[PDB]
Amino acid sequence: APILVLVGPPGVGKTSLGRSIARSMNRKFHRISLGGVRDEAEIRGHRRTYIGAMPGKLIHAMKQVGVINPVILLDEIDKMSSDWRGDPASAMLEVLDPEQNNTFTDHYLDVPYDLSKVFFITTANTLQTIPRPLLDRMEVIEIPGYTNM
Amino acid sequence: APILVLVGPPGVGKTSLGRSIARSMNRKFHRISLGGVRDEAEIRGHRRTYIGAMPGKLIHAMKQVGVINPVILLDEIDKMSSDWRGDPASAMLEVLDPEQ
Amino acid sequence: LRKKIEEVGMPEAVKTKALKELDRLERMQQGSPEATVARTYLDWLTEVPW
Amino acid sequence: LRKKIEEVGMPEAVKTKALKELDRLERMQQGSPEATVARTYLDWLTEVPW
Amino acid sequence: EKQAIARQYLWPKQVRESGMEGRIEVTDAAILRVISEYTREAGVRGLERE
Numbered sequence A: 001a002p003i004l005v006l007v008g009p010p011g012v013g014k015t016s017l018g019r020s021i022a023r024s025m026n027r028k029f030h031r032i033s034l035g036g037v038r039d040e041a042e043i044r045g046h047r048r049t050y051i052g053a054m055p056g057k058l059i060h061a062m063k064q065v066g067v068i069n070p071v072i073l074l075d076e077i078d079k080m081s082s083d084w085r086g087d088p089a090s091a092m093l094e095v096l097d098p099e100q101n102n103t104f105t106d107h108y109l110d111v112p113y114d115l116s117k118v119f120f121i122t123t124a125n126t127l128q129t130i131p132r133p134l135l136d137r138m139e140v141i142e143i144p145g146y147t148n149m
Numbered sequence B: 001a002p003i004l005v006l007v008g009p010p011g012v013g014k015t016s017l018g019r020s021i022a023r024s025m026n027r028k029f030h031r032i033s034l035g036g037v038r039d040e041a042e043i044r045g046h047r048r049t050y051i052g053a054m055p056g057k058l059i060h061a062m063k064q065v066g067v068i069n070p071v072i073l074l075d076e077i078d079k080m081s082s083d084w085r086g087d088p089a090s091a092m093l094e095v096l097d098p099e100q
Numbered sequence C, D: 001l002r003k004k005i006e007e008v009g010m011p012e013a014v015k016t017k018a019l020k021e022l023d024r025l026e027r028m029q030q031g032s033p034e035a036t037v038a039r040t041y042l043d044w045l046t047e048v049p050w
Numbered sequence E: 001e002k003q004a005i006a007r008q009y010l011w012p013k014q015v016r017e018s019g020m021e022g023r024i025e026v027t028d029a030a031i032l033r034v035i036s037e038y039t040r041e042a043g044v045r046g047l048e049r050e
């Protein structure tokens, strides 16, 4: 399945286009808002030896949807931090890798899990705050902005 | 056995060489994805006094593989994070020491 | 839970791992704080789609 | 498990450790919050490759 | 090197995965134009998407 990224100024329809795409193809839909996500423990999970441990956002999203091929919108992928506290942009290299994401390994589930059938759509306002190994995995579609007509 | 690091630009076949080298020598293969890993208890384990304890990714990887000489890919080793709280790059000094 | 492991999915390696985990769970006393963590894990393995 | 300990591998300083732990495990009550720790530890010792 | 990679590895795979099976074909000058005018990379992922 494809891994797209839609890049453009605000107010053009990027967030609302994911639900229309998923509705036209009769496929399930789920959103993950990545804006301000700061720690790595939400992409992967924790080991099942801490007391409140549970899987990350992707395994939980695949549980909500019942099938193995949904459309999953990863909203605001450029507003995701890489500071001191956590680096979730380096944990996304395992998820969006088009050749290796059939063996995605969560920390809670100790088993490899196949994420190669899921239709990923990600949205961003500019490309300059995306790490260069992560941008190279995604296909760009540019949404320009409207004229007066 | 050798210990290698492959360095280069993004799209060049670094990750893809693991299964090729392992298939070429009839060896077992396993892949451990580092990168963003901040927990030192992924490299080693917990002391089995604790209540759901189990060993690290390396003993688990050697248990998945059946043999004592596999090929193990450690993917994105420059993307681990080391600071006051969270330092798995200091526990990797014991697994890659060529004589200890 | 054994029937549910048999029905949905799943690949053979993860099915073998789940059956060894269930055989471990059957022979420890219930309500133990390790029988809880060995049960939540099997719920998560049987509730994701394969 | 005794046959597994004295067939695969293993070095003598680990084999003595393992046989001592099994001799402790043969005295505990079949149960138990403290028998499952010993049996899980011996399963990890016998299933890792030597 | 990119032209030899695109002839021997990348274009047959993209042909097989699309259902076209000997119905479409590129020349060598076409591959060289795709490399030189539609790509600024060191790797081969952008060429593969083209």
Ligand SMILES: Nc1ncnc2c1ncn2[C@@H]1O[C@H](COP(=O)(O)OP(=O)(O)OP(O)(O)=S)[C@@H](O)[C@H]1O
Pocket (backbone or CB within 6 Å): A099, A133, B009, B010, B011, B012, B013, B014, B015, B016, B017, E005, E009, E044, E045
């Ligand atoms: N010399 C080559 N011959 C054939 N295929 C190649 C060659 N170099 C790269 N590829 C292909 O290019 C793709 C990308 O390879 P990867 O190893 O995944 O790149 P990568 O360097 O690991 O990416 P990152 O960002 O560094 S993890 C794979 O499908 C490879 O098969």
